[PDB]
Structure formats: C-alpha cells, structure tokens
Amino acid sequence: PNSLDQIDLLSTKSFPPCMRQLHKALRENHHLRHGGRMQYGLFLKGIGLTLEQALQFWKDKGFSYNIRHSDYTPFSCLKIILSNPPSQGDYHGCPFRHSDPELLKQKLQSYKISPGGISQILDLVKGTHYQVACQKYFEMIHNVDDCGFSLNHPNQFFCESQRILNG
Amino acid sequence: SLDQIDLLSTKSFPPCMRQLHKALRENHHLRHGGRMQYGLFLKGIGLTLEQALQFWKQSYNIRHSFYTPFSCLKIILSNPPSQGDYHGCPFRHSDPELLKQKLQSYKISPGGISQILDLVKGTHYQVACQKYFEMIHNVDDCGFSLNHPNQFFCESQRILNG
Ligand code: SF4
Numbered sequence: 001p002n003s004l005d006q007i008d009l010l011s012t013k014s015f016p017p018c019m020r021q022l023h024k025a026l027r028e029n030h031h032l033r034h035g036g037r038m039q040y041g042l043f044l045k046g047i048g049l050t051l052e053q054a055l056q057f058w059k060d061k062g063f064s065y066n067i068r069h070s071d072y073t074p075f076s077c078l079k080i081i082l083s084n085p086p087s088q089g090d091y092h093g094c095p096f097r098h099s100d101p102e103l104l105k106q107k108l109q110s111y112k113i114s115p116g117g118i119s120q121i122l123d124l125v126k127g128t129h130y131q132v133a134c135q136k137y138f139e140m141i142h143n144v145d146d147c148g149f150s151l152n153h154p155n156q157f158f159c160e161s162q163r164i165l166n167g
Numbered sequence: 168s169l170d171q172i173d174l175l176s177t178k179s180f181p182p183c184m185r186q187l188h189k190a191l192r193e194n195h196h197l198r199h200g201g202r203m204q205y206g207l208f209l210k211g212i213g214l215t216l217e218q219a220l221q222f223w224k225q226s227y228n229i230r231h232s233f234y235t236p237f238s239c240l241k242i243i244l245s246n247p248p249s250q251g252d253y254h255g256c257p258f259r260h261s262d263p264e265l266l267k268q269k270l271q272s273y274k275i276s277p278g279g280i281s282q283i284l285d286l287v288k289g290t291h292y293q294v295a296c297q298k299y300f301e302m303i304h305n306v307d308d309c310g311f312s313l314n315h316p317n318q319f320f321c322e323s324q325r326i327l328n329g
C-alpha cells in the first residue's frame with residue numbers, strides 16, 4: 001500500500017487531461033463519486049496499479065485512498081466522451097468535451113500551455129475534435145511536433161507518453 | 168521478494184527482460200550489463216531491484232520505489248553480450264537455433280516461430296518482438312510501433328487488465 005501522492009508527478013507528466021483532473025480532485029477532496037472512482041480507478045488498473053478506497057477509524061467523508069502494484073474494463077476515449085456525462089458533484093468525463101470552453105481555457109492556462117497551443121486546442125474543440133485537441137495537448141506537453149499515433153484511449157496516451165519520456 | 172514477479176515476467180516482459188529475470192532467479196546474480204538493463208526496466212515500472220545485506224556484519228529483493236530505462240536501439244546496437252552476460256536483445260543476440268528453442272519453451276506455435284525467424288533474418292528485430300507480443304496476447308495486430316521494452320510492458324498491462 002502506498003499514498004496517492006507518489007504519482008503526483010506522474011499525473012502531470014503522463015496522464016491525459018481527463019485522468020489528471022481526477023487525480024487532482026481525489027487529492028484535494030479525499031474522495032470521488034462513483035463515476036470518478038470508475039474512470040480513474042480503471043485507468044490505474046490498466047497501468048497495473050490497484051486503487052484502494054478505505055474508511056478511516058475516526059469517521060469530510062473520512063475516506064483515505066492508496067495504491068499498490070496489482071472484472072471491469074478501462075474506459076476508452078469514446079466511452080468517456082459519449083456516455084456518463086458528469087453531473088455537478090462529478091469530476092469525471094473528458095475536459096475537451098465536457099468543460100465549458102471558458103473553464104477549459106483556464107484549466108489549460110493553469111497547465112502552462114502556450115497561448116498559441118491553447119488557441120489551437122480551443123479551435124479543435126469548437127469542431128468537436130476532442131481527441132485531436134488531446135493529441136495537441138500531448139504534443140505541447142512532451143514538446144514534439146507530431147505525437148505519432150491516433151489517440152483513442154487514455155491508457156494509450158499514458159504508454160505513448162512514457163515511451164517518449166523513456167527515450 | 169524477487170519471486171513475486173515470476174508470473175508477471177512471463178506475461179508482460181519483453182524477451183530481453185524475461186531472460187534477465189530468469190537468469191537472476193537461477194544464477195542468484197547478474198553482471199553489471201545485466202543488472203543495469205533489467206534494474207532500469209524495473210525502475211520504469213516502479214520497482215527497485217536491490218541486494219539485502221545485514222547491517223550488523225562488518226538475496227535479491229524488489230520493492231516499490233520510494234534512472235532512464237534502456238530503449239530497444241540502445242540494447243540492440245550497443246554492448247553485445249559476452250559469455251557470462253545475459254543482457255541484450257534475444258532477437259539480435261541469440262543464435263537463431265537457440266532463439267527457436269527459447270520460443271518453443273515460451274509455447275509459441277511452430278508457425279509463430281517461423282514468422283519470427285524470418286523477420287530476425289531480415290534484421291527486423293523490433294517487428295519480430297511485436298510479432299511475439301501479438302502471439303502471447305492473442306491479438307492480430309498490436310497497434311503500436313515498438314521501440315522500448317517499457318512500452319512493451321505498458322502495452323501488455325493494458326491487454327491483461329482489459
Ligand atoms: S481525449 Fe480521450 S484521453 Fe484525452 S482527455 Fe478526452 S478522454 Fe481523456
């Protein structure tokens with residue numbers, strides 16, 4: 001068992017916007033509603049990590065989460081984009097599809113993306129080209145001109161990001 | 168304990184690291200070239216390989232980490248192994264008859280083996296490795312372009328936990 005904070009750096013470097021957001025929310029709120037627990041939990045499962053939810057003796061909902069090295073299937077991009085739209089207490093979904101563009105812009109700014117980077121992303125989103133906007137985000141983040149793959153799965157994003165960071 | 172990943176090694180490690188694990192388990196030691204290739208791979212998956220000692224004096228273990236892993240080209244192009252060394256890329260470094268025997272022991276089908284040998288003969292080491300990935304995961308097309316042992320692992324984990 002290990003704390004979720006062991007993968008803070010990893011989320012920033014290799015997690016797609018949709019999992020990055022869930023990691024953040026889990027870390028700041030100490031919980032996630034079902035949709036989030038599924039999307040994020042299953043993503044981690046795909047990498048080979050087991051997320052564990054626990055209730056602390058003193059019970060703030062009073063949960064604590066951990067992870068360890070290791071049923072349901074990790075969600076693809078189309079699954080995330082097209083089904084289970086997030087409600088107000090929810091942090092799941094795809095921020096390209098689900099975030100109001102003003103709020104998406106502010107998230108992307110907090111991520112230190114360039115204005116030209118942001119502007120290309122927002123134009124792709126207007127077009128409903130969510131996955132291509134996410135490749136664009138992959139390119140900005142890894143500082144490469146062509147991601148070189150056709151994005152269709154948050155788990156693929158991770159493997160492809162790691163492969164670049166691994167040389 | 169290093170034996171906790173014996174199973175994982177058969178299911179998701181590329182040939183090159185699966186042989187390092189087997190040799191470390193059998194030989195209770197690996198030379199530097201081997202320790203670096205396998206140790207860094209493990210680091211890439213979030214594990215630290217170390218030897219346990221007794222602090223009170225004047226066994227290889229693995230644990231969660233509390234280091235850039237070698238790529239396919241780095242392994243293939245450099246440091247050919249000597250006798251006594253278990254590092255490198257089997258596709259490039261093993262005698263084809265010994266590679267055939269290793270694949271048989273991995274339960275690759277006769278047809279699978281022939282495809283892999285043909286590819287090795289043309290020097291398409293990575294593509295042979297992709298063919299091996301496809302056969303051990305029973306998928307017709309791996310869908311990615313392989314250039315790093317940690318990528319092989321990462322992609323295997325997606326399938327296995329799918
Ligand atoms: S595109 Fe696929 S991966 Fe990128 S964020 Fe939307 S869902 Fe997650």
Ligand code: SF4
Nearest residue numbers: 181183239256296316
């Ligand atoms: S190809 Fe890359 S991964 Fe497959 S074995 Fe040779 S080195 Fe290891």
